[PDB]
Amino acid sequence: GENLYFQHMKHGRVFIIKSYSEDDIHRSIKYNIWCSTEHGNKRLDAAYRSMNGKGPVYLLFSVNGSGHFCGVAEMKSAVDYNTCAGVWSQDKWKGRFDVRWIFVKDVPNSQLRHIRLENNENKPVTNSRDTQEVPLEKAKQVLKIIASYK
Ligand SMILES: CNc1ncnc2[nH]cnc12
Ligand SMILES: [Cl-]
């Protein structure tokens, strides 16, 4: 058989999201919202707005030190930078944007550590920092691995 679904798109951008907090992951799944750092929010906002709805901005979530990704979400709005403070575990985040979680599933780093990022010094995708962008051809490979893991 074959899965040629992901191997076909050109308009799409994909970012790693790191979270120190398991509580924040749960709150994001529950309420379909997220917030990054200042520079992270700016990165995501720029990608969402220049995508202008002609493709998805995907977010690959991983809790720092957990050893695995925990799921996939799509950005669903621009960054609102002036919102209620202290809704996350730490009060160091300013703003909010909408997401839609697509997959909630733990995927061990062992399944993904062979994919390396030419834009991040050929480092494994599993050694990324928050809002590291993933080149589309590597992003396709990661997404197929996540969707097929069981
Ligand atoms: C709510 N946003 C976050 N929560 C915990 N850790 C992080 N690292 C980057 N963004 C976050
Ligand atoms: Cl704003």
From Swiss-Prot:
The record's subcellular location field reads: Cytoplasm, Cytosol; Cytoplasm, P-body; Cytoplasm, Stress granule; Nucleus
Q: What is the effect of changing residue 34 to A?
A: Reduced binding to N6-methyladenosine (m6A)-containing RNAs. Reduced ability to undergo liquid-liquid phase separation. Reduced binding to C5-methylcytosine (m5C)-containing RNAs
Q: Which residues form the YTH domain?
A: 12-146
| Tissue/organ expression | Highly expressed in induced pluripotent stem cells (iPSCs) and down-regulated during neural differentiation.
Signal sequence: where?
A: none
Q: Where is this region: Interaction with m6A-containing mRNAs?
A: 10-150
Q: Which domain of life, per UniProt? A: Eukaryota
Query: Where along this sequence does the record place binding of RNA?
Result: 18-20, 24, 34-35, 64, 88, 93
- What's this protein's family per the entry? Belongs to the YTHDF family. YTHDF2 subfamily.
Q: What is this protein's function? A: Specifically recognizes and binds N6-methyladenosine (m6A)-containing RNAs, and regulates their stability. M6A is a modification present at internal sites of mRNAs and some non-coding RNAs and plays a role in mRNA stability and processing. Acts as a regulator of mRNA stability by promoting degradation of m6A-containing mRNAs via interaction with the CCR4-NOT and ribonuclease P/MRP complexes, depending on the context. The YTHDF paralogs (YTHDF1, YTHDF2 and YTHDF3) share m6A-containing mRNAs targets and act redundantly to mediate mRNA degradation and cellular differentiation. (Microbial infection) Promotes viral gene expression and replication of polyomavirus SV40: acts by binding to N6-methyladenosine (m6A)-containing viral RNAs.
The domain section of the record reads:
The disordered regions have the ability to interact with each other and to 'phase separate' into liquid droplets within the cytosol following binding to mRNAs containing multiple m6A-modified residues. This leads to the partition of m6A-containing mRNAs into membraneless compartments, where mRNAs may be stored, degraded or used to transport mRNAs to dendritic arbors in neurons.
Tell me, how does this one assemble? Interacts with CNOT1; interaction is direct and promotes recruitment of the CCR4-NOT complex. Interacts with YTHDF3. Interacts with RIDA/HRSP12; interaction leads to recruitment of the ribonuclease P/MRP complex.
> What protein name does the entry list?
YTH domain-containing family protein 2
Fragment boundaries within the full protein? 408 to 548 of 579
